[PDB]
Amino acid sequence: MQIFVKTLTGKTITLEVEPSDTIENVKAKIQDKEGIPPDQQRLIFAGKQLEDGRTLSDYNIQKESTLHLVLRLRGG
């Protein structure tokens, strides 16, 4: 299924995922497609930060859901 990941810069990233995929998996997919390191990523859904070891199903992230991607601000 497709889900959407929307950055705070207004960019929508489309991912191909299964409900059983982990949040760690999803962050790796985002790194693959965009180059954003997983350790920078905070994925948010329904006002909650998603935990790496849980699944999309655990959060009832259904197909065509939008996650928000908040980036940690370091260095620089």
Binding site: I44, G47, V70, L73
Partner: protein, 45 residues
């Protein structure tokens, strides 16, 4: 400002929180929204 109202709407939407909480996270972080959202989501310990 239209900018600060927008920042508050966006914060409250991402955080699914009320407007007062959103606005005060913003104001206390120099009106820097991504920084303020990081603070909202960093777990208390």
């Amino acid at each position: 400002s239209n900018a600060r109202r927008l920042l508050c709407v966006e914060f409250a939407s991402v955080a699914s929180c009320d407007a007062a909480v959103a606005q005060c996270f913003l104001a206390e972080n120099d009106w820097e929204m991504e920084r303020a959202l990081n603070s909202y989501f960093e777990p208390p310990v």
